[PDB]
Amino acid sequence: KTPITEAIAAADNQGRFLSNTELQAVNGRYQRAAASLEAARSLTSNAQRLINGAAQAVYSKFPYTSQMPGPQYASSAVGKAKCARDIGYYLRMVTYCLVVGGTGPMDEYLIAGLEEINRTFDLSPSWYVEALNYVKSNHGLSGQAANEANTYIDYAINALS
Amino acid sequence: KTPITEAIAAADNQGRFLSNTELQAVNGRYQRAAASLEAARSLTSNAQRLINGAAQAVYSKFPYTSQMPGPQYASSAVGKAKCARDIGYYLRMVTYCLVVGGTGPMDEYLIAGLEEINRTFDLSPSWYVEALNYVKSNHGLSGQAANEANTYIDYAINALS
Amino acid sequence: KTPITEAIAAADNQGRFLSNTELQAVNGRYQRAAASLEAARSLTSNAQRLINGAAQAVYSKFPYTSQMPGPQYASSAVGKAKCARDIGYYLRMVTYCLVVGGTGPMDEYLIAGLEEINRTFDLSPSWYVEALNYVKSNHGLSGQAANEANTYIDYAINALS
Amino acid sequence: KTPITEAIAAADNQGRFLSNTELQAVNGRYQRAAASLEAARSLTSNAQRLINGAAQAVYSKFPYTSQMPGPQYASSAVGKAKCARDIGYYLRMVTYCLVVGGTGPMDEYLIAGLEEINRTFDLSPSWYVEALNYVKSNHGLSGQAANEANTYIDYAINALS
Amino acid sequence: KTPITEAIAAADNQGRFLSNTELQAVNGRYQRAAASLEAARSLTSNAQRLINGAAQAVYSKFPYTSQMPGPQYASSAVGKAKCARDIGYYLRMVTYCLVVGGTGPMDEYLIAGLEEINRTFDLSPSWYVEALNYVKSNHGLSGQAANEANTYIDYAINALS
Amino acid sequence: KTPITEAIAAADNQGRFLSNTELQAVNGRYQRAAASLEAARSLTSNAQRLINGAAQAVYSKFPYTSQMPGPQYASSAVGKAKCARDIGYYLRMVTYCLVVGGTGPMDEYLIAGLEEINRTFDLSPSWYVEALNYVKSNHGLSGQAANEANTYIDYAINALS
Amino acid sequence: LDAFAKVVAQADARGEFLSNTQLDALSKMVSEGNKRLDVVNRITSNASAIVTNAARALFSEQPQLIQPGGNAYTNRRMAACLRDMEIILRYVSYAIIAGDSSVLDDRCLNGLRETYQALGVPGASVAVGVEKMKDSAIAIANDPSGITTGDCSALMAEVGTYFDRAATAV
Amino acid sequence: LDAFAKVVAQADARGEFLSNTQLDALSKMVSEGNKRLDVVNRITSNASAIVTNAARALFSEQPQLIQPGGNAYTNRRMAACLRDMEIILRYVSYAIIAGDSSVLDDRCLNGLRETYQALGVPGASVAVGVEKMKDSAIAIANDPSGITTGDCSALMAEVGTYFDRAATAV
Amino acid sequence: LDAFAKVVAQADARGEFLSNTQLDALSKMVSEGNKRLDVVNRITSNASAIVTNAARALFSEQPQLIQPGGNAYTNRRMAACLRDMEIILRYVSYAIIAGDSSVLDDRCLNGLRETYQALGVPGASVAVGVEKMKDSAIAIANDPSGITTGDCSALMAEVGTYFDRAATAV
Amino acid sequence: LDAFAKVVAQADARGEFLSNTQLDALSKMVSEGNKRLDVVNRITSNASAIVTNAARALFSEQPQLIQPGGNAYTNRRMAACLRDMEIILRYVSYAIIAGDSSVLDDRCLNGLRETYQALGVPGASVAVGVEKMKDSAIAIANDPSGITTGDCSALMAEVGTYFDRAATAV
Amino acid sequence: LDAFAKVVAQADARGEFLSNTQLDALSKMVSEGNKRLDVVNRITSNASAIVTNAARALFSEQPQLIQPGGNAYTNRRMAACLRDMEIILRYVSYAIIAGDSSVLDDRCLNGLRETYQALGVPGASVAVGVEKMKDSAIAIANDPSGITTGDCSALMAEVGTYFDRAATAV
Amino acid sequence: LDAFAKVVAQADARGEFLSNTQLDALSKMVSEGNKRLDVVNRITSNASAIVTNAARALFSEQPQLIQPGGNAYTNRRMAACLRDMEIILRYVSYAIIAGDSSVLDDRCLNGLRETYQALGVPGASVAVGVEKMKDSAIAIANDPSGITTGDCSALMAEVGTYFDRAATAV
Numbered sequence A, B, C, D, E, F: 001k002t003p004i005t006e007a008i009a010a011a012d013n014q015g016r017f018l019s020n021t022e023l024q025a026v027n028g029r030y031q032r033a034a035a036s037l038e039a040a041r042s043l044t045s046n047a048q049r050l051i052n053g054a055a056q057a058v059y060s061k062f063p064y065t066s067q068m069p070g071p072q073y074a075s076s077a078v079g080k081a082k083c084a085r086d087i088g089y090y091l092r093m094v095t096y097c098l099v100v101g102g103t104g105p106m107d108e109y110l111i112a113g114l115e116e117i118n119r120t121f122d123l124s125p126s127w128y129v130e131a132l133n134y135v136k137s138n139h140g141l142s143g144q145a146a147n148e149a150n151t152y153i154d155y156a157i158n159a160l161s
Numbered sequence G, H, I, J, K, L: 001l002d003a004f005a006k007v008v009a010q011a012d013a014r015g016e017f018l019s020n021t022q023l024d025a026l027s028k029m030v031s032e033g034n035k036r037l038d039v040v041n042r043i044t045s046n047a048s049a050i051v052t053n054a055a056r057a058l059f060s061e062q063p064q065l066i067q068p069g070g071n072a073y074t075n076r077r078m079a080a081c082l083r084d085m086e087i088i089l090r091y092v093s094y095a096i097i098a099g100d101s102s103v104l105d106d107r108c109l110n111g112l113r114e115t116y117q118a119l120g121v122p123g124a125s126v127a128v129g130v131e132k133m134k135d136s137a138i139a140i141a142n143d144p145s146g147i148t149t150g151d152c153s154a155l156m157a158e159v160g161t162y163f164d165r166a167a168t169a170v
């Protein structure tokens, strides 16, 4: 799913050529893309720092996650690596959404099945909400680039709430 | 149907808030609107001249339409008035499409039922295609305003072909 | 589709043997067939004359069709041949309807897709209505044979109106 | 259900005027009606004799039906009256089928629910088959009138077998 | 169909593990099985006597079945063998129902198609009802074993009524 | 939903009387009811102690739940009361399941909507799993009464995992 | 119901065979069958012209219907209007072949008044259209040319009743 | 609802555990379970006879029902009538196993009076049929032969109430 | 296809009117129409007996079919077997009225061999049943009693071909 | 309808082109488009918090709603309640992007009062929840931080009207 | 089929009553019924833990499955994988209550190998997961604590066969 | 997929962020966006003429297609043929806006060769029609009149590839 494939899908569902409405929709994406791609480049360039900082923000907010025994916690080397990996997944998904101009990548790769996974593995959505909030507070973006990044970060937060 | 109501309808069909994709789509419309509204203002200001000229273009291309007896022809005062009225309808519909940013008004008010009406009343689609071509050739628009007007005029021509 | 296949289809749709009602329906066809087959033989024997005369009737009623340049008109040798061919198709379809006892052949071979074809190729239904009217006025049939022929000719006219 | 209502229903199901096929079907009924109405008049005029004789034919073929105690048998005055009543119903239904030109009356008034009734009340279909066979053997009709009567009598026999 | 397969089917239809309700249902069957299996063993051990006696009970109640010519009657050696065979089928089905704990075997092997067969071959349901009543009156079971046997015999009687 | 209403629903869905299979199913419930009702009486008599102890077990296992500020935690008087209330709800639901012989009450009153509520209000399923485990470890039931109680407690745990 | 079924239904409710008088009346309907088929064929064969000419005359007399804001303005509403004229003509033709108005009443006219009122369709204007179709349909059906000469006055009165029934219903 | 669910639903709305008295009442229902199952089995096992004998007696007493024009005349209407008798018996049997009339009320009796009035089904006659089934069903259920002797008077009164409820509803 | 449509379809693919010879052949089919209708009516009117007697004779000759484990054992399989005999007779009767085997081939016989093979239905035994129906159907259709005397030998040969086609297909 | 379609629909019914004044008004709506998109984005981006905080505040003020027997007691009813809050917020957001309340009225608010009355949902309590969402949504939408400074007072008044419309409707 | 139906089906095809030996074998299955129910209850009651612990162990041993590009990478694929583990456990539990593998074969295992091959699901890895579930399920089912002491060795062997059947099928 | 999604999908399977080089390539696609939209608009705006002129030229060159017996003879087959030309043009236009052929391949071209072979549609003739549309579509899209002058040669090559892909597929 992207702004362009959604336009194509709507047209195809009705057996018709792309409408002027749909061309305007694609233009709308092209116009927004400068801000989106700026956000993607920046988040990518700062990825390791954002991921490391976000993980630390979670451990700080929820100290028990570093202490309690169990596979679901970051109280082992494996657990700490799983956590940083997951946070990296979220950040990577945000950059994909920015690149295509919609939530499709996040929806398909991350949000579908999320509730099942979090319940099954005893992972708290609130841990991930804190990581995402750290990213918002620390990406250092401005203007519409910041707006774009925060829109997709907030989309993930909404899904976890 | 408009770019905005289509965005709302897509969101509602899926039980969700408007997506960033849909906000970009609405932005796309807003960006295109300057050209659309310029075209609408111009066509409106020149309406009588365009309608009169278009009707004459049809009578010129198809001389029999002024001569042959029958209610379907412009060979009576009533018939000539019907024809100018219809051409005015087409022009008015084009301005409505420009205003809302899509073919919705033309689709609902004119294209739905068109083939039935033209067959029932023995009206030739080609007569209307000539009127529409006259408008394209004589509106005097430039740049993207001309593009917008011609896109909707061509949409009507496609429906008649 | 024929009176007999329609009877079979109705019976089969309900998982039952042919009803006495359906046998009466087939008898009804057999009784009407003398008039139908007389009409078919006559129209066939006079085919070239009816086709030539019908084409001329159209050119007479609509003189522009012989004059205006364009592939849709009978203003070229190819166009005149296309027109006579089409009129021959209509006459042939009428004879097929007479033979089977219903509009099935005309419905399948000619009426399905008719509106699309006429719009796509800029052919006026009214041209064909005049050809069909010429055939009615000139077949020289009487009694129920004339009734049968005119019923199917009128069916085609209704489809074009 | 009649030949005419079936024609109307087929036309209406397809949103169209009656076809020439359907007019031929109705003509088929009208042609057959002379034989049908002759059969109806005759069976009606001989009704009491046919009913009385048919009942006796059943009691003769199945002597136990006059002897065995139980409400399902003709071994009481009430039972004998029920039996003659039922046979009268069958004969009356046959005359209705002849009148309308199809099995509709018999289907609606008698055949729908027949198997349930016969099982529930312990009535043997074979009793009724004998009554119907008596009627065939004793109506004294000839030619197509006999054909019509026997067609509907046989339809009832098939339903009971 | 059995109590256990019905429990599995209900669970599977809802994409879930067996419920405690369904385990209780299976326990209910296991508890009833002692009586059911006792009934099955007894009926089986006495099968020939019950079948022979039941056939005689039918011939006694309906003397015409031994006398009237025709394939549907027990008035020939073949017919008498068919009848005893059928009664044996009913008894065997009852033992199968007892074994699995429900009517599944009888429903699948005997009741589905029963009305068609009895009408087609002119067999009277009442003949079989008498055979089944003989079995009830002569199996010699007591307590819940008798209850189980009679429940399934009565189920067959209901189907024939 | 109960074992009895499920039996009725299955019968009604198929337009039939209760089957012997369904009567066995209801018997299965009646047999199990002694153990179920014993469990219900005991859990009820010990309710306050089980609820208080379960709440303490959660606070012990997850000390942060008494400390962290926020409406989702038991770090305020309101929060501690909410938690004890919820645990009481779970216990009460278990007694209802025992009483009716299935999970219907828990499914309708508690499990439907559970995931939405826990995500919306930031409540951790694991908190409730600990409370339920405390109840299992402390009800003091034996034999099949213990089995019944633990079956429904485990059902809730599965839903939370 | 057709005319034959109507009598049968009444008889069944009384448990009676049709009388000789009733049978004779049905035979009479059969004898008039050719004329009845000609009426149906002639109306059907001219259906497009009957509807279109009536619609054109209606819009000429009531120009408001087609002006902007009028109920038959826009091609979608015009098409729906033409469709309704055709639908009524179609159901009238069914009533003719049946010799009974039940199909016209049951499948077409019942509830139509209220349907139109709810939509804002001017029922009185539909009735004008229907009456225009009545006149042209009867003129066509009763045309003395190209048919074995005979008396169809009874049939034409009957046809009139079906059109009138439709006009009344709206 | 069954009897158990009924008490639970009331308790949940009050946020309360069942009391010991309530639990004891449910235990009592369980102890009467064998008798209740025998009632359901006996009625089910004799269902065809219960319905057929009641219907036959009804038509004998009210011959108008079956004469031409009568509501149970024609095999289709007769089959529908027999079906309704069976349907009512079936839902009564469900109420018995449940120890609660809610299924009978909700899925069968609610709106039935108005349904019958609209169709022209004589509800008062259905009630006569239902009361005939009541008497034969109770006689069968309470038959002293072939069963461990005991007191089922309370159950028979309860069964009576369900039949009466159905008769009242029509 | 019916016989008339078959010729029309072939002609259309060639872009040709039917010839006088072809028209005459169709007129001949019409003239034989009464006989063809009598054949269809006689077979239809005796359908239950034709199927039942053929099935009975089949099971008498092949007792294995009905013994436990046999393909026609159980009432469900017996009913399916009788249904198939009726289905084949029905489609043969359609072919007769059509004067063409296309409906029989397209809706009934195509894929039937493979259907039977997959299910374990003994196709060869079905063919025996079909041939038994052929003989009784022709004997009934060609019965000299109660009908205007005439020659139906051509029709009886044609009817035979349809039955044979069905038998071959299984 | 959106604001643009609304004017077009009114014009079409009058058969008129939009006036220059009308075109200028539409151009003005376009020029305010960025602000309108920010409002929709901000509300959407904070939707879970807006609904949850309003619901929590509602239940804190009206504890009866959640106590046993209360309309929002049980997880199923609580989920339905939270869903309704979200649904209303969603349709309000649609009205904002459209600059017209028609979608909110037509698909959400019409018949809602009667729906709630029939179910026993306390509409007055829903209105309290809606008004709580109004205040938090406007505070979020009109937050001066992290956005190009400008005047959105007109938009905030408009947003208020949609929330008020919803509250009134229940 | 359940174990009881299996014997009945075989007997019916032979036209035979069950023998005393066969009846005794069924009685034996009934006598082991309590143990069988305990096995099903214990597995069901621990289903989430059985699946989750087996899945976790599988992913720990085969880290490739969860790395980007791996078949269980993405939450949608992970959820599908966990679902499949649960589905297999569920159908194994059905086979246990039935004392027959037919439901497991017919509704779950048939065609699964080819389904996985077409999708790119590593069947061999699913088998590892299934075998892990086998070990934990049997350990749970055969736990000596909190249950009347007795011998369940035969049942545990049978349970093993169903898990093995599933593992083989993939 | 669109061009953007294609790169993302490949990256996700590798667990990688897009590189700066990849981001720059996407930015370049965006910068060419106006030209791409003009291509799509021009083709769409002339769709009827593109299809009709190509079809007319095809039938002129291959008169057999339209003669009796030919695949495009009869109005139904002609309409289907024109529809297929339009369908291919439509899917090509989708591929253009997407900058990727996946929609054209997945929803249109996959299986089309075999579909045509089964129906008897001459695929080679469809390819001639497609190539005619290619030439007229490119001539229209690349028309120097009425547009800001610039270089679209890369786009025209890309458009060519989609048409060629379609022609090859048939």
Ligand SMILES: *C(=C)C1=C(C)C(=O)N/C1=C\C1=NC(=C\c2[nH]c(/C=C3\NC(=O)C(C=C)=C3C)c(C)c2CCC(=O)O)/C(CCC(=O)O)=C1C
Pocket: C020, C023, C024, C027, D032, D143, D144, D147, I031, I032, I034, I035, I036, I037, I038, I039, I041, I141, I142, I143, I144, I147, I148, I149, I150, I151, I152, I155
């Ligand atoms: C072969 C079949 C029959 C042999 C055996 C027998 O010697 N004659 C053969 C059948 C014939 N029927 C004939 C006349 C005839 N049959 C019908 C019956 C149909 N007409 C339809 O309207 C109805 C359908 C509902 C059917 C059934 C009719 C009306 C006639 C004409 C009047 C008659 O003679 O009774 C003939 C004679 C040749 C013919 O008139 O075509 C044969 C031979």
